[PDB]
């Protein structure tokens, strides 16, 4: 760790504190991740150490490279490759003009490819979000910081606790599903797809209940008709307000029909009815895909 000179704070997260560092020996710039441990009342730090190393062999052009893991003391560090910008800073710097469709489509195609990859290895991300997506000058985009089945260590008290932004969280996770599948990542990606098009978060909930109701008000309240088993779910309540379903024309304009269709299959309430990453790659929406490069101010 002392073999890395910090440059600046590159990011955050519930899992740790991301920094832009330079290898004192190599010279190459990396993205070092500080993960503090709770030696007061620790739990399965060895069960995790193995789940982290399984990520080192997870190489794909659309997945940020985990270079190496260094466990020294009360801290655990993850050395990642560095890209020049996260999709949040880019979207914000594009709120005025809007990310061109060819670029939005290129991005979705790659994300779906990398997501399709890690999925075929029974690996999920669980916490997809624009700040976790890294882009470069050459027009590529990668998925970053794959969350574990159960995070660990010690939460941040300065950044303001553990649970913060739950805008792209799937309804099954909100309804209490403890054994969720690859579908949670697709929902999240579907929410990012929409935000990139409309230039406004699809479902910007403050809390869990608000997130869930924010989804209900737009896609209508789920029932046994559209989501078999929804009412038997751990956190469902018969007293849930019953809202009407809205047209995607009103939800994601001016996305063409090809886009609204694909996004509609990504935001299906029923996890088992939700479109798979590799299935979404064959969608007609990707008929005329290309890889244009972004305009970046670094
Ligand atoms: C959140 O997790 C990660 C992991 C590896 C990373 C970055 C973020 C990351 C973010 C970032 C934001 N501005 C340039 N890079 C980076 O470059 N490499």
Experiment used for this model: X-ray
Q: Which fold has domain 1-84?
A: Phosphorylase Kinase; domain 1 (3.30.200)
259 is in an annotated binding site: no
| Resolution of the PDB structure in angstroms | 2.5
**In terms of residues, how long is the chain?**
298
210 is catalytic: no
- Please report the sign of the dihedral spanned by the C-alpha atoms of residue 75, residue 76, residue 79, residue 83: negative
Chain-centroid distance, C-alpha 212: 18
Mind giving me the DSSP string for the chain? Answer: -TTEEEEEE----SS-EEEEEEETTT--EEEEEEEE--TTS---HHHHHHHHHTTTT--BTTB--EEEEEE-SSEEEEEE---SEEHHHHHHTTTTT---HHHHHHHHHHHHHHHHHHHTTT---S---GGGEEE-TTS-EEE--PPPSS--S---TTTT-S----TT--HHHHTT-SS--THHHHHHHHHHHHHHHHTS-SS--SSHHHHHHHHHHHH----TTTSTTGGGSTT--TT---PPBPPHHHHSTT--HHHHHHHHHHS-SSTTTSPPHHHHTTSGGGTT---PPP----
Compute the distance between CA of residue 118 and CA of residue 64 in angstroms, rounded to an integer: 12
Site to substitute for ligand 1 among 62, 68, 83, most atoms within 8 A of C-beta: 83
Neighbours of 49 (CB within 10 A): 13
Domain 85-297 has CATH 1.10.510.10: yes
Q: Which of 127, 185, 247, 288 is catalytic?
A: 127
**Distance (Å) from CA 250 to ligand 1 centroid:** 34
Residues of the chain within CATH 1.10.510.10 domain(s) are 85-297
Cα atoms in the 13 Å half-sphere on the side-chain side of 250: 6
Nearest to 100 by CA among 3, 192, 199: 199
Residues of the chain within CATH 3.30.200.20 domain(s) are 1-84
């Amino acid at each position: 760790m002392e073999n890395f000179q910090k440059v600046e704070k590159i990011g955050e997260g519930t899992y740790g504190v991301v920094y832009k560092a330079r290898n004192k020996l190599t010279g190459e710039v990396v993205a070092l991740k500080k993960i503090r441990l709770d030696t007061e009342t620790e739990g399965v730090p060895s069960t995790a150490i193995r789940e982290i190393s399984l990520l080192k062999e997870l190489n794909h052009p659309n997945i940020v490279k985990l270079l190496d893991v260094i466990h020294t003391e009360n801290k655990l560090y993850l050395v990642f490759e560095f890209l020049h910008q996260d999709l949040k800073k880019f979207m914000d710097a594009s709120a005025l003009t809007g990310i061109p469709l060819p670029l939005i489509k290129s991005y979705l195609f790659q994300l779906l490819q990398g997501l399709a990859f890690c999925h075929s290895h029974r690996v999920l991300h669980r916490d997809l979000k624009p700040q976790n997506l890294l882009i470069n000058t050459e027009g590529a985009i990668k998925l970053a910081d794959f969350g574990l089945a159960r995070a660990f260590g010690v939460p941040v008290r300065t950044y303001t606790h553990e649970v913060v932004t739950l805008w792209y969280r799937a309804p099954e996770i909100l309804l209490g599903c403890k054994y969720y599948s690859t579908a949670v990542d697709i929902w999240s990606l579907g929410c990012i797809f929409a935000e990139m098009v409309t230039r406004r978060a699809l479902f910007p909930g403050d809390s869990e209940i608000d997130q869930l109701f924010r989804i209900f008000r737009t896609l209508g309240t789920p029932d046994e008709v559209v989501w078999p088993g929804v009412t038997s779910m751990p956190d469902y309540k018969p007293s849930f307000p019953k809202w009407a379903r809205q047209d995607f024309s009103k939800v994601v304009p001016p996305l063409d029909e090809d886009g609204r269709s694909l996004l509609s299959q990504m935001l299906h309430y029923d996890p088992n009815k939700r479109i798979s990453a590799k299935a979404a790659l064959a969608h007609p929406f990707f008929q005329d895909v290309t890889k244009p490069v972004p305009h970046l101010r670094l």
